[PDB]
Design a binder for this molecule. Structure first.
Ligand code: NA
Ligand code: NA
Length: 327
DNA sequence: CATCTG
DNA sequence: CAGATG
């Protein structure tokens, strides 16, 4: 956690580069397990040879740790932090919808700046385009102050379209977080579940509303279960307008809501730990359900849920208010 | 994993 | 359809 810091860190720096720059999924994938092992590792690695003793630990990595161990730097890391090429990938990518693959094509085409981009808006799909139009707005965090206004807006709409909808904004928002990255709504409807053969309108009808009232400013992708798009709180008495934000709406069968809703609430930690205990208690969990675990190794059969409360009970647990769902 | 691109 | 993004 702090003893093999630099090492894991350098490892991680490297891994990253293999994947983003190099297409180097393998290598990339390699730095990752090593970085992972030295991490758990209780000792203060004092050498490569020492480290190498580790699984995941090859010679190559041992060699780099050595150099690092020796010098507060690494040349290869040093070479990378310069390469306008390497740099231009990291940068581009930041653009929503720009992935690494693209980050390369773009560079090779000589597009390396945000300017480079606008310049060639033509060669960018709608996602990318929206992604560049609100580059600024998208990096900005989301104050809970705005969150609640946001929430309140959504909820008031959906209720309006159907008394029967059940929306829930998950996330850290949900956990108490003072600020958030994007808006995440969990969607449901009684009339829709596991077997229940569809109802697309179920997701659209709402997407529609939001635009009706203009909250949803743009669409990124919209499927019949998951929508990816833009929102914005109306600017008051003109002087201070909001920035644009990312939001996501998604249809969930009424029969695996709480499991999703529990799930998406995080934190990641609270999840596994919940899960690991869920395991003890003779159960299993995933994003969708809780299944009584056989002894034969495994088994299933979706235990019925009607709140995140049902789940706690199942695995016999202390119902946690989302707040403390930290770890 | 669900959507988009081409 | 593969392949890419989130
Ligand atoms: Na990106
Ligand atoms: Na392939």
């Amino acid at each position: 956690e702090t003893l093999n810091g630099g090492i894991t860190d350098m490892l991680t720096e490297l891994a990253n580069f293999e994947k983003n720059v190099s297409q180097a999924i393998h290598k990339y994938n390699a730095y990752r397990k090593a970085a992972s092992v030295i991490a758990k590792y209780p000792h203060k690695i004092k050498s490569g040879a020492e480290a190498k003793k580790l699984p995941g630990v090859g010679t190559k990595i041992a060699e780099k740790i050595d150099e690092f161990l020796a010098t507060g730097k690494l040349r290869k890391l040093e070479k990378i932090r310069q390469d306008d090429t390497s740099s231009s990938i990291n940068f581009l990518t930041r653009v929503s919808g720009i992935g690494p693959s693209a980050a390369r094509k773009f560079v090779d085409e000589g597009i390396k700046t945000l300017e480079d981009l606008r310049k060639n808006e033509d060669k960018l799909n709608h996602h990318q385009r929206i992604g560049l139009k609100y580059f600024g707005d998208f990096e900005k965090r989301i104050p809970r102050e705005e969150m609640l206004q946001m929430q309140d807006i959504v909820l008031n709409e959906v209720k309006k379209v159907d008394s029967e909808y059940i929306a829930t904004v998950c996330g850290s928002f949900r956990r108490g977080a003072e600020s958030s990255g994007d808006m995440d709504v969990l969607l449901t409807h009684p009339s829709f579940t596991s077997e229940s053969t569809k109802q697309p309108k179920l997701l659209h009808q709402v997407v529609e509303q939001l635009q009706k009232v203009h909250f949803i400013t743009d669409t990124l992708s919209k499927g019949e279960t998951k929508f990816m798009g833009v929102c914005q709180l109306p600017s008051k008495n003109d002087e201070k307008e909001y920035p644009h934000r990312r939001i996501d709406i998604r249809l969930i069968p009424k029969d695996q809501y709480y499991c999703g809703v529990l799930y998406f609430t995080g934190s990641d930690i609270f999840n596994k730990n919940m899960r690991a205990h869920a395991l003890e208690k003779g159960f299993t969990i995933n994003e969708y359900t809780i299944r009584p675990l056989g002894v034969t190794g495994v088994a299933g059969e979706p235990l019925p849920v009607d709140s995140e409360k049902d789940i706690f009970d199942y695995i016999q647990w202390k119902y946690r208010e989302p707040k403390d769902r930290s770890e």
